[PDB]
Amino acid sequence: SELFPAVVKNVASKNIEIKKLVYVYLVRYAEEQQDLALLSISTFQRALKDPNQLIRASALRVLSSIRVPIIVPIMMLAIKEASADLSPYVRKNAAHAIQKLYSLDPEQKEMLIEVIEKLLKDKSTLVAGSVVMAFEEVCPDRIDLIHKNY
Amino acid sequence: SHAGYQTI
Amino acid sequence: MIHSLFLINCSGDIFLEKHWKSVVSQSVCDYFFEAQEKAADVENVPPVISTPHHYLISIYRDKLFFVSVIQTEVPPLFVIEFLHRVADTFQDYFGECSEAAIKDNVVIVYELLEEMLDNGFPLATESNILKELIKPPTILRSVVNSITGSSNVGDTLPTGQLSNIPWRRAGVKYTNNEAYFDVVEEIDAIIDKSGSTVFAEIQGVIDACIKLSGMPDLSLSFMNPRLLDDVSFHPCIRFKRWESERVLSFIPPDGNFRLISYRVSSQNLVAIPVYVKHSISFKENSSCGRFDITIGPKQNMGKTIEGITVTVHMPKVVLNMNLTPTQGSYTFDPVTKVLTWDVGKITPQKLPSLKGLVNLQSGAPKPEENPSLNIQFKIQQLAISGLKVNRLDMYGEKYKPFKGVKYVTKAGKFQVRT
Amino acid sequence: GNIFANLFKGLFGKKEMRILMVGLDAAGKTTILYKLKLGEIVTTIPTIGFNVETVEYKNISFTVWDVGGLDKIRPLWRHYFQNTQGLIFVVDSNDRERVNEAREELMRMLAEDELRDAVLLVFANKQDLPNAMNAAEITDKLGLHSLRHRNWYIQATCATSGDGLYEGLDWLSNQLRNQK
Amino acid sequence: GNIFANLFKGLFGKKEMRILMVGLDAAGKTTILYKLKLGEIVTTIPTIGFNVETVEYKNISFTVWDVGGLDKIRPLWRHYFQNTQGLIFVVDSNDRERVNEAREELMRMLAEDELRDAVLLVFANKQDLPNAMNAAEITDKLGLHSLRHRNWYIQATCATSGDGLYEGLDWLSNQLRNQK
Ligand SMILES: Nc1nc2c(ncn2[C@@H]2O[C@H](COP(=O)(O)OP(=O)(O)OP(=O)(O)O)[C@@H](O)[C@H]2O)c(=O)[nH]1
Ligand SMILES: Nc1nc2c(ncn2[C@@H]2O[C@H](COP(=O)(O)OP(=O)(O)OP(=O)(O)O)[C@@H](O)[C@H]2O)c(=O)[nH]1
Ligand SMILES: [Mg+2]
Ligand SMILES: [Mg+2]
């Protein structure tokens, strides 16, 4: 934990394996150094717009993962934007990010229910399972929602 | 490597 | 679901620490240590252990304990299979899962665990997709990376992930177009003191090593399908066609792969290959006794039995044991009272056997029974189930790959009462 | 023979696959080109002439020309038609008002004898818009299924997120870099 | 001695001259960095963390960090102060309302012992604005003439036209790449 400021500076390096390793470090130690961990959020924001969708998925994973209570609004915006990414892999990672957000902020439950209701209508075979997982995790009692999708 | 295998 | 994973040796030391949701105190492993202490062996560890504020679900395999942590309600089968799969993938990328194999390659295994499990949820589970997201640690790849700055981490999502066949990467080519199939059968059996058949069965499984290029559609069919029942099927097969046409038409993925598994119906008698003559004496409070075992082939279908090993867990009364083997190797560890004899091969000219005297404990009463007899054996070019393939057609490609099949029968859980 | 220059080029990717990008005003063509070349969003004014950038992807050196869609230069596309291999045609996902003109001009461009040998790829940009048309309805209005003897395909895309741009490049790579 | 690696680097320019860019919100720092790296104008949202790009100019590999000016991250600049050589400080040409806060924060940054050895260059971005202040009045409000023992200079600039950006790089090159 003493080495957080030195590592965080490289969070935008163009060397990809260095990217993955620094992502690991931030995921590990974010919850201690709240103020220091704020620094990577802009790089994540930019990565969310990259034409490569796999990079988008990685950025979504990390941006969800950071448990700094300040970044609640930008994360909320991030899931809402990823909601219709038209890239199904990003969609599955979005479902996981929804579960992440609910784990971090209980008070967003109504919005999370709305976005999950949006997700269930997806015809993509590789997102349905994760979306159902999200439903079980966040709102187990919403038997109303799935009725059309049975 | 192909040795030991019955033809099919 | 899964919060974090602790990789702990049978020693009692904690080697690989991982976390996915929140930092779980390492103190939680103390409960595992205590539960291990109460049990009589490492093998006796529960798979579900309850602590005041965490649940531990464990796997035991290859002298390494994999304890995970859970805080919500999750189906036990889910966790147990995910852990067994991380073990399997460790085997695939490093030959095997050992504390040496882990500690020697810390960075790659941490990257792997990060890729596979996301917030305790399954992200990447199929072998081939994981092969392309992160490369195997090939030494030539390592020197190439050092030379050119190339990376072990990919940058493009493999097309198979978004394909209608998520189990195999697309666009794979090999100059040596070939494919191998392996049908391995195990003889589960219990044999009484009288040599009668207590309960026996055949457990059969098809393995397939595929080195085809392109997008082949392989077809596997059998001469005697009626012998197949309760057959298992990987996602790669089209269940509807098997139900209708009784044909294994499928698209195999790359690399090593277990194709289908099956059992043989109890309607047909299981052909037991090996019989035994056996005799041990235990005089009460005597310092010595006699041991006599003779391994014999009963139904070999005209095929040789090889790779034979006999292990016996002697009771506490035994101190030492004076025997001479007719072949193979005689080994006895007095600390664990384990009687291990390497038999090897059986020659019809002379049946291998093991006989001699047992150095017992003086003043120790005779044990109430003789420990049962377990025996390992392998038969090559023979499937006791009598299953046979019919044909191997291919569609979608133009080449004619090398085609071959094997039939190897390896002993199942074969135990002989005495 | 001493062809080592071509082998050296093929060791890294010699495919060029010249592409001409055409469309109507405000379709997003220029933003597509510049995000492919750079990645971000760049403040831009209407383009009245043409641009060029070279992008490398999957060992293919794609070169895309951004000829403007303004009517004041519209007939000028004829001069760029020769020697092209790919024809990018962007359709605004919510230009129901000018969709018929788009289809008419697209059919006219397909009518060029020089462009007879090209492959047509329709990018449905502005996918983010709520009142945006889906792929199916865009195809229905364009009648790209009515086309014959022309390899074709359509792909939904959102430029501000870059959604599917790599995918369109992948499609061209499969077809532009086909068996020959 | 075998120092051929350094000679090879100097045959093309090894100077690095790390630069930290700091300023207040909406000063235009981020646009400056990205136009230097690319050349165009890129649509951008407020930056809440930090960015990095490497730009080469006159055989000098300048590296500029864009740490955000938002108050929610303002004190965090301390962590980047070490090992820097250049301090870019952008001033909005018409931020007469927040100019005093800008000067206070600039003086505070000059008060860092780590930054004692740096060279300060004040970019007066937004030069295009009509109601924009000239260089002289900006200096008068900033009191950069009151500074002592600190090499300094100010340069008017307009990012949307890129006016003087090369010139600021030239000034840094003269001073950052000084006699030693
Ligand atoms: N909402 C939305 N706007 C977009 C999208 N793509 C481009 N735009 C906007 O559409 C407008 C026109 O984009 P341009 O790229 O200049 O259009 P063009 O096809 O180059 O126009 P011409 O130069 O006249 O041929 C700009 O304001 C873009 O930011 C998109 O996917 N969604
Ligand atoms: N008129 C005018 N606007 C400019 C100029 N330079 C930048 N801007 C605009 O000023 C606004 C803010 O620019 P940014 O580059 O995002 O400002 P910043 O300093 O990076 O802000 P933070 O990220 O919050 O630190 C944007 O709308 C820019 O287009 C300029 O020279 N003239
Ligand atoms: Mg344009
Ligand atoms: Mg900024």
HEC readout, chain A? CCCHHHHHCCCCCCCHHHHHHHHHHHHHHCCCCHHHHHHHHHHHHHHCCCCCHHHHHHHHHHHHHCCCHHHHHHHHHHHHHHCCCCCHHHHHHHHHHHHHHHHHCHHHHHHHHHHHHHHHCCCCCCCHHHHHHHHHHHCCCCHHHHHHHC
Tokens 């250049």, residue?
A: E86
Classify residue C36 by its DSSP letter. H
Q: Which of D35, D39, D127 sits opposite A86 (nearest CB)?
A: D127
Q: Using a CB-CB distance cutoff of 8 angstroms, which residues of chain E are in contact with residue D43?
A: 40-43
Give bridge partners of residue E156 from the DSSP assignment. Answer: E124
Task: Indicate which atom in ligand 2 lies nearest the CA of residue E27.
Answer: 19
Q: What's the CA-to-centroid distance between D47 and ligand 3, angstroms?
A: 4
E41 near D CB under 8 A: yes
- The whole-angstrom separation of Cα C409 and Cα C204 is 9
Report the C-alpha gap between D129 and D96 in whole angstroms.
13
Q: Is the CB of D155 under 6 A from ligand 1?
A: no
Residue E119, strand partner residues: E86
The answer to whether A31 faces chain C, any CB pair under 8 Å, is yes
**CB contact, 8 Å: E38 with chain D?**
yes
Q: Structure resolution in Å? A: 4.3
Which token pair is C268? 């047909």
Q: Which residue from C389, C392, C406 is facing B4, i.e. has the nearest CB?
A: C406
Positive/negative CA dihedral, A41, A43, A48, A52: negative
Give, using CA atoms, the residue closest to atom 6 of ligand 1: D28
Q: Which of A51, A85, A87 has the CB atom closest to D36's CB atom?
A: A51
Q: Is C105 within 8 Å of C136 (Cβ atoms)?
A: no
A33 touches chain E (CB under 8 A): no
Location of structure tokens 């992948």: D170
3-state secondary structure of D124: strand
d(CA A137, CA C72): 10
Calculate Rg over the CA atoms of chain A: 16
The response to whether D126 counts as a known ligand-binding position is yes
Residue type, A24: V
CA distance A89 to D130: 21
Rounded Cα distance between E81 and E83, Å, is 7
Q: Which amino acid, E84?
A: T
Q: Do C378 and C306 contact (CB within 8 A), yes or no?
A: yes
Please tell me the distance from the alpha carbon of residue C334 to that of residue C327, in angstroms, as a whole number: 21
Cα–Cα distance measured from residue E59 to residue C289, given in angstroms and rounded to the nearest whole number: 92
Q: Pairing state of beta strands E60-67 and E152-156?
A: unpaired
- What is the distance of C-alpha E167 from the center of its chain? 12
Q: How far is CA C411 from CA C91, C330, C375, in A?
A: 23, 21, 8
User: Residues with Cβ < 8 Å from E109, sequence gap 6 or more?
Assistant: E22, E77, E81, E87, E89, E115
Nearest CA to ligand 1 atom 14: D28
Long-range Cβ contacts of E8-12 (<8 Å, 24+ apart) = E12/E59
E chain contacts of residue A35, beta-carbon cutoff 8 Å: 76
Neighbours of D146 (CB within 10 A): 8
E25 Cβ contact partners less than 8 Å away, ≥ 6 residues apart? E46, E69, E70
Question: Any idea what DSSP says for residue E107?
Answer: H
The pairs formed by E160-163 with CB atoms below 8 angstroms and a separation of 24 or more are: E160/E31, E160/E41, E160/E128, E161/E128, E162/E35, E162/E39, E163/E127
Handedness of CA A117, A121, A122, A127 (dihedral sign): positive
Identity of the residue numbered C312: V
Q: Which residue has the tokens 């085997």?
A: C91
Q: How many residues does chain A have?
A: 150
The identity of residue C305, as a single letter, is I
User: CB-based contacts of C215: which residues, under 8 Å, 6+ apart?
Assistant: C170, C251, C396, C397
CA-wise closest residue to A54 among E130, C368, C71, C159: C159
Looking at chain C, which residue has its C-alpha nearest residue A101? C119
Give the residue ranges of DSSP H helices in C191-261. Answer: 239-245
Residue E69 Cα: closest atom of ligand 2 = 25
Way the structure was solved: cryo-EM
- Chain E CB contacts of D32 under 8 Å are none
Beta strands D86-90; D18-23: pairing state: parallel
Measuring CA to CA, how many Å separate A58 from each of A50, A64, A92, C400, D58?
11, 10, 12, 41, 21
The number of CA neighbours under 13 Å toward the Cβ of A115 is 26
Contact E49, A43 (CB under 8 A): yes
Residue with tokens 């599917």: D164
Q: Does E40 touch chain D (CB under 8 A)?
A: yes
Nearest CA to ligand 2 atom 11: E26
Contact D75, D114 (CB under 8 A): no
Closest D-chain CA to A48: D161
Q: Enter the DSSP assignment of C136.
A: -
Q: Is the dihedral of CA D136, D142, D148, D153 positive or negative?
A: negative
Helix (H) or strand (E) holding C199, with range, is strand C197-211
Chain C residue numbers touching A52 (CB-CB < 8 A): 155-156
Contact D64, D36 (CB under 8 A): yes
- Give the whole-angstrom CA distance, residue A48 versus residue A59: 6
In terms of Cα–Cα distance, which of A120, A117, A125 is closest to A149? A120
Chain D to chain E, count of Cβ pairs less than 8 Å apart? 23
Kindly state if the Cβ of D129 falls inside 6 Å of ligand 1: yes
* DSSP state for residue D114 in the 8-state scheme: G
Beta partners for residue A83, in sequence order: none
Q: Write out the H or E segment, with its range, that includes residue C295.
A: strand C288-297
D134 vs C281: CA distance, rounded Å: 85
Q: Is E160 within 8 Å of E128 (Cβ atoms)?
A: yes
The ligand that comes nearest to the alpha carbon of residue D25 is: 1
Q: Is E72 annotated as a binding residue?
A: no
A 10 A CB-CB count for D41 gives 20
H helix and E strand count, chain C: 8, 23
- C270 phi and psi, to 5 degrees? -80, 125
Q: Is D69 annotated as a binding residue?
A: no
Q: Which helix (H) or strand (E) holds C145?
A: helix C139-148
Contact E70, E48 (CB under 8 A): yes
Decide the pairing of beta strands C14-17 and E41-43.
unpaired
For ligand 2, atom 2, name the residue with the nearest CA: E126
State CA A116 to chain mean position distance.
Answer: 14
Ranges assigned E (strand) in chain E: 18-23, 41-43, 50-57, 60-67, 86-90, 119-124, 152-156
* Residue B4 near chain C (CB below 8 Å): yes
Q: CA–CA separation, E56 vs C251, rounded Å?
A: 52
Sequence length of chain E is 180
Residue for token digits 């002592």? E148
Question: What is the residue with the minimal CA distance to atom 9 of ligand 1?
Answer: D28
- C261 phi, psi to nearest 5 deg: -130, 155
**Ligand-binding site membership of E94 (annotated):** no
> Measured in Å, how far apart are chain E's first and last C-alpha atoms?
22
CB contact under 8 A, D40 and E41: no
Tallying the residues shown for chain B, one arrives at: 8
DSSP E strands in C314-416: the ranges are: 318-325, 329-333, 338-344, 353-360, 373-380, 389-395, 402-416
